[PDB]
Design a protein around this ligand. Structure first.
Ligand SMILES: C[N+](C)(C)CCOP(=O)([O-])OP(=O)(O)OC[C@H]1O[C@@H](n2ccc(N)nc2=O)[C@H](O)[C@@H]1O
Ligand SMILES: C[N+](C)(C)CCOP(=O)([O-])OP(=O)(O)OC[C@H]1O[C@@H](n2ccc(N)nc2=O)[C@H](O)[C@@H]1O
Ligand SMILES: [Mg+2]
Ligand SMILES: [Mg+2]
Ligand SMILES: [Mg+2]
Ligand SMILES: [Mg+2]
Lengths: 380, 380
């Protein structure tokens, strides 16, 4: 049983050459900037991390974080799959508490890593690899909380903008070598999302359906308008640095590739999502919104994780990836006038994309761990 | 003018690594077998090659062959673009003479190469690269001669079968290292095509429309039935050797790749041609058959030439190639319910595929020529 399962999750060919892993060993983390709300929370997080026992490995906290986040959002998705129903109030509280636990466990893992001398390139790749998967579920859970499924165009834009903004933050890191925090970053967005879930508890659908008297717009467009305003502001800060801050030869990226090369990957994901939406004869997204976002979210999360791998190995990005096979199956199905029911194909695309993400992650983590001789979830 | 034009035809990145070209230098041509009609023509070709002056480089004869073949077929395509009209009789004679000149010039180029000590890996790549382009035009010209455009399903199968059979002959060479001639090969097929053009001169449309009394099938299906029978016979000889004749480790190819890997490339070309045909709302192939065959022919010819390159460099085949961009443009256009007229998109796809083929060929030929220090069209 263990031999077949291990063979199922290992990639047939090693994803990294021997020279990139050695180059990965020479990598040294550099970050700059300070978020607006971060200095107040540091006192809380410094208290919390000191209570964690020293024998707990860093990557085990992260996986606990994801598991709490996945379970609470999947339960919320289970109760409200078209985003029009109302779930029991305690489910939103559980998601609210789960995200607060996630944020608290994320922010202390590197403090535990420092204190215990267990900082490693595996930890950095795993952390940012965990952040990439969590981001799709938090924005989806937000969309459920505001019942944005009744207005799909706003739902489509907001969910994919968050994934695109998160990828673009990592894109800046691929060119410049340094993680730069804005005034509004992950902490402010997540704090805004936890409070929003509590208003969804207090006011329900009548609050969200109430009219804002000054603007004559529905209240549901305000988080989306905040997403528009937030995207423009965040992109402006990020885009100045990609075009002017290239440290490679002749202002190229650190890998010597074109500064526009990561755009094509996330752009292809967003474009494919747009192609399937506007051509669907059965209104696929409107009938099954949560399942669709999860399918392309795993595709998007893997593409982000490949950029992290590309960052850590100082390598080029190949546009051709197996992650697009699942969306292509959906894309080919719509080409034949939906000869098979798209809902069945979407489940096939979901299951494939999930397993393909997990297979890549397990194979990369195991290969690096064997080379550096540490265990991923155990301290020696 | 010369700097911009040279930049237009060179690929931005060198297609071959330094180690594959060195490995290409160690390649030694090996062939086995004898065709049925070849021993009688050898006496004629030995007479002809002795009359060619020794200062003519081999690759210049080949390019003369292609130019005569291209011009005569394009003139025939110019007169009969839907394959239903009748061209003037002298145009078929010119094509008949042109193919006879092609065959005669092809068969003597290696004899000239031997006699003059000018045999080189560039010559072998250029020769098989020239054969791959000529094959699409000869089968297309045959289809014009029999007016097969009135029956598109037979026209589609026969043209693509010839390209697939020719690729498969080279596929056997990629696994086994040796060119194996059958009893029915290029010589017998071309001799059958020259005689067929002369019957098209003698009998015209009434002969081709006459009923065969014993079978109750139209005469137009007989070359296609010969193509079916020929494909089955030829595939049977070829397919035994791919499955049992692998000389690599554990019966793999000489490059260590799966024996099924070349199938995916030519299969994708044939499948794409099939997708665009059956979904077209405007009956695109029936209105513009010659233009369609030329578009996918250049795609198919390049993919064959990449296999030749893959053979000569003992390298793996990458499925991702720029040659598919042109068909994909057509494929994406049909996905949006033909928002642009497919005829215009097909011209765009033709022009792109032609330039992309030429760009690849010029860049590869120039890179190898500079490394081995010979001139492609000039003997020192
Ligand atoms: C801004 N925060 C701190 C609130 C959260 C986002 O920040 P993050 O999690 O991307 O990184 P961070 O600022 O916590 O940095 C912690 C650092 O610890 C290291 N790290 C992380 C995870 C892990 N399993 N092992 C590690 O050694 C990495 O070098 C990481 O960069
Ligand atoms: C069976 N024929 C001979 C009628 C035609 C098909 O055969 P082909 O053209 O593939 O090869 P061939 O049997 O003429 O072999 C001629 C050989 O000459 C060499 N050659 C070819 C072309 C060229 N410009 N320079 C060369 O040195 C190659 O090694 C080639 O293999
Ligand atoms: Mg952290
Ligand atoms: Mg983190
Ligand atoms: Mg020859
Ligand atoms: Mg030849």
């Amino acid at each position: 049983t263990g031999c077949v399962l291990n063979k199922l999750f290992q990639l047939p060919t090693p994803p990294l050459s021997r020279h990139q892993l050695k180059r990965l060993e020479e990598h040294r983390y550099q970050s700059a900037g300070r978020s607006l709300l971060e200095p107040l929370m540091q006192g809380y997080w410094e208290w919390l991390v000191r209570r964690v026992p020293s024998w707990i490995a860093p990557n085990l906290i992260t996986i606990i974080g994801l598991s709490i986040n996945i379970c609470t959002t999947i339960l919320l998705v289970f109760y409200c799959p078209t985003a029009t129903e109302q779930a029991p109030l305690w489910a939103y509280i559980a998601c609210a508490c789960g995200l607060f636990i996630y944020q608290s466990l994320d922010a202390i893992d590197g403090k535990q890593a420092r204190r215990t001398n267990s900082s490693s390139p595996l930890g950095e790749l795993f952390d940012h690899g965990c952040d990439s998967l969590s981001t799709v579920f938090v924005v989806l859970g937000t969309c459920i909380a505001v019942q944005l499924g009744t207005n799909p165009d706003w739902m489509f834009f907001c969910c994919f903008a968050g994934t695109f903004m998160f990828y673009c933050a990592h894109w800046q890191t691929y060119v410049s070598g340094t993680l730069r925090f804005g005034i509004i970053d992950v902490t402010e967005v997540q704090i805004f999302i936890i409070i929003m879930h509590l208003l969804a508890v207090i006011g329900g659908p009548p609050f969200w359906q109430s009219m804002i008297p000054v603007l004559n717009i529905q209240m549901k467009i305000f988080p989306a308008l905040c997403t528009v305003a937030g995207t423009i502001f965040s992109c402006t800060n990020y885009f100045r640095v990609i075009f002017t801050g290239g440290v490679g030869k002749n202002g190229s990226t650190i890998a010597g590739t074109s500064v526009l090369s990561p755009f094509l990957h996330i752009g292809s994901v967003i474009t494919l999502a747009a192609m399937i939406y506007k051509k669907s004869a059965v209104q696929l997204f409107e009938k099954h919104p949560c399942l669709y976002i999860l399918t392309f979210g795993f595709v998007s999360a893997k593409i982000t994780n490949k950029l992290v791998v590309a960052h850590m190995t100082k390598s080029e990005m190949h546009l051709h990836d197996t992650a697009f096979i699942g969306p292509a199956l959906l894309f080919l199905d719509q080409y034949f006038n939906s000869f098979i029911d798209e809902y069945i194909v979407l489940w096939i695309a979901l299951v494939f994309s999930f397993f393909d993400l997990i297979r890549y992650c397990v194979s990369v983590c195991n290969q690096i761990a064997s080379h550096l001789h540490i265990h991923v979830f155990r301290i020696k």
